[PDB]
Amino acid sequence: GSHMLDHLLEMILLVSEMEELKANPNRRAVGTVIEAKLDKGRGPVATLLVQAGTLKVGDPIVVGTTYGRVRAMVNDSGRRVKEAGPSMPVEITGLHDVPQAGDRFMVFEDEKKARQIGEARAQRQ
């Protein structure tokens, strides 16, 4: 989005997703994983480029054909965070299955709640 002013934007899990961000031809809201492997301590980790929207901890993420929930978020700079924005490489965890590099993952709620509240574009009346 346009920056997204930090206060408290409720977003946790998705609701009813039929939205098109339009980014990849595979699904109109996905991204590609750059490297993915298991870590004997951190768990199955997947360094990816979030393209579907915004990647946050707690997201139910679908990587390839397996879904999981983002346990920890480590970004491009190597910092653990809570929420990362689009176009930024981040490494997720909590797939509990084998993630693959070059695969495609789907993560999007993003405007869902903002729009729900009436913050983003929907239709205020």
CA gap 90, 71 in Å, rounded: 12
Residue 119, SS3 per DSSP: coil
Q: Hey, where are the domains in the chain? A: 1-125
Helix (H) or strand (E) holding 112: helix 111-117
Spell out the residues 6+ positions from residue 47 whose beta carbon is closer than 8 angstroms to its own: 33, 34, 35, 36, 89, 90, 91
Strands (E), the chain: 31-39, 43-49, 55-56, 60-63, 66-69, 73-75, 80-81, 83-84, 89-93, 104-106
Experimental method: NMR
Q: What number of other Cβ atoms are within 10 A of residue 100's Cβ?
A: 17
Enclosing H/E stretch for 114: helix 111-117
